[PDB]
Design a protein around this ligand. Structure first.
Ligand SMILES: O=C(O)CCc1ccc2ccc(OCC(=O)NC3CCCCCC3)cc2c1
Ligand SMILES: [Cl-]
Length: 291
């Protein structure tokens, strides 16, 4: 379990960013690592087999806005990024989950298109294939995996921000609605901790949120837990050693540098560190420290 860092990739502040930075919860230190080949915001990060993957997003720059179909792989042993097979379609404001070594890319936008499509990456073959689409088009969707089931939570369908959520059952290649959240949330941080799917922050169509709710997959209920110190939309999120970490986002005024940590045993949030600069729309995941 030792030696793991929280990696943050990409993001947005005035334009899309290429930063790869890694935080060590054990000593508070931050490292700046190899830049992404292409700056991207609205991407997702995940880890398979010790490799960090950056999936999708958009490059916003003064010279254009290009939605990304890219899958890129970072190896901490070499501090190098390598291109992987690209997705069938660009996906900005994507959600990603991993089941049994396979990456699922969910939703996202391509220009004015709001995707319901979903595709699955096989690292051993370096191939993507489409799977069943969701029941709802969703961008800014939160995705997490619990007990080898894939959840897609909230988002924006092109007309309305959503409180709905749905679950993908891989052995039936089928999506089913689950109980909707109590709050409409687009751009929430969604993760899994113990037996619950957590949805932190987001935008409800009127304000950035500090509220946090969790779905118990056995009881099928959503329950609020302690709110974050900061309202945040387009935040990064991950779980590490039994605690949720939220990174950055937008509070309606500032692009935040704050990182908060949720302890489920005390039901409290604490501010633990600051990123090197405020930013939103980052991809976050946890893997071994680099060499
Ligand atoms: O339209 C809605 O309902 C809300 C839209 C939404 C939802 C999720 C996002 C996730 C990442 C993401 O990255 C790029 C990103 O930070 N952009 C913007 C968000 C922060 C403030 C405005 C300027 C930058 C964007 C997202 C946008
Ligand atoms: Cl861990």
């Amino acid at each position: 379990k030792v030696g793991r860092l929280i990696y943050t990739a990409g993001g947005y502040f005035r334009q899309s960013l290429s930063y790869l930075e890694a935080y060590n919860p054990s000593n508070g230190s931050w490292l700046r690592l190899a830049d992404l080949q292409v700056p991207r915001s609205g991407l997702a990060g995940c880890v398979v087999g010790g490799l960090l993957y950056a999936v999708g997003g958009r490059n916003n720059s003064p010279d254009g806005n290009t939605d990304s179909s890219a899958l890129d792989c970072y190896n901490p042993m070499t501090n190098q990024w390598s291109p992987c097979a690209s997705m069938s379609v660009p996906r900005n404001r994507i959600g990603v989950g991993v089941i049994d070594g396979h990456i699922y890319a969910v939703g996202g936008s391509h220009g004015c298109i709001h995707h319901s499509s979903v595709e699955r990456y096989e690292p051993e073959r370096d191939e993507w294939h489409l799977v069943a689409p969701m029941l709802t088009r969703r961008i800014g969707v939160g995705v997490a995996v619990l007990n080898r089931l894939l959840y897609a939570v909230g988002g924006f369908d092109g007309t309305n921000r959503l409180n709905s959520a749905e679950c993908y059952y891989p052995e039936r290649n089928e999506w089913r609605m689950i109980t909707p959240m109590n709050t409409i949330r687009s751009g929430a941080g969604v993760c899994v901790l113990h037996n619950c799917i957590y949805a932190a922050g987001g935008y409800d169509g009127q304000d950035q949120l500090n509220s946090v709710e969790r779905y118990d997959v056995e009881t099928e209920t959503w329950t609020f837990v302690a709110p974050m110190r900061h309202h945040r939309s387009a935040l990064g999120i991950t779980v590490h050693q039994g605690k949720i970490y939220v990174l950055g986002g937008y509070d309606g005024h500032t692009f935040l540098d704050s990182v908060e940590c949720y302890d489920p045993d005390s039901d409290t949030w604490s501010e633990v560190t600051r990123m090197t600069s405020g930013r939103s729309g980052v991809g976050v995941a946890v893997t071994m420290e680099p060499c």
